[PDB]
Write a protein that binds this ligand. Sequence first.
Ligand SMILES: COC(=O)NC[C@H]1C[C@H](Nc2cc(-c3ccc4cc(C#N)cnn34)ncc2C(=O)NC[C@@H](F)C(C)(C)O)C1
Length: 283
Amino acid sequence: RFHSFSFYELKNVTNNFDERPISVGGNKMGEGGFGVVYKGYVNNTTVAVKKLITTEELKQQFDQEIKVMAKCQHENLVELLGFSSDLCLVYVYMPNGSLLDRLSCLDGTPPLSWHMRCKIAQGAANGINFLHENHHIHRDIKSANILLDEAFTAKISDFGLARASTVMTSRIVGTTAYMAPEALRGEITPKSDIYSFGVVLLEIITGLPAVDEHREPQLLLDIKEEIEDEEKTIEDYIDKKMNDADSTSVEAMYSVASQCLHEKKNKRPDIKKVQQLLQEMTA
Ligand SMILES: COC(=O)NC[C@H]1C[C@H](Nc2cc(-c3ccc4cc(C#N)cnn34)ncc2C(=O)NC[C@@H](F)C(C)(C)O)C1
């Protein structure tokens, strides 16, 4: 299915895996929890190279990503091009990088409009729906894992922690600021993917990172209780780096996120309902 690269090819096309940033003149575009993403050129096509605690489960996570990517092909899913059994995964380059970096206007990029943010939220929901319809749990839904293409179309990436589908594990893994309570207790369920998406919806509305050490509150999901406790409303948190936001659409998106962030897992909506509510918001 995929093209087995060789380490030297990637070493060549990524400039000795230059850890310098793209702006200065390097090839490093970002990092995750299990590797660093480098920019490369194969044929004449631009590619992203992910060069990946426990060495054998790193290799299982390598295999899992290929395992899931071979059976998962959707408009709102990233595309894997090849691999290299240091371990490496080659993807199609996303011209607009990550939703996290664009919400931050990293490297001087212009702020996302509310119209673009709405399309991004719908696309990411369509991707999660495709995964849940194929009985897959991502286990790391976050804005740094939602990438944006040449049309700012949302694409979910990093399927290395994905699992098939309630069960429990001994290896709790994820990004704490996005995880539902049952996921932090060790449960494995698609209902945790919904909760993480709700955090993403809050980052899209507010433009704030999920966790900031030098901020009150430090956790974004805690603004739901402040609004619920009549202290604030969603309009006190709307990203001010927008000129096309209306109160109805934003309050519509907040209601979806609030439903997704229900502390009880069985009260959250399924991803299909999330798709429905996000489409009614624009139609
Ligand atoms: C694991 O770590 C992260 O995904 N960290 C998040 C980090 C890496 C991400 N940036 C990128 C990721 C990908 C990409 C394409 C497929 C895949 C697949 C995976 C996987 N799995 C990861 N990335 N990826 N293409 C391009 C970029 C990028 O910067 N373009 C420049 C652009 F932003 C701009 C505006 C011109 O500056 C931020």
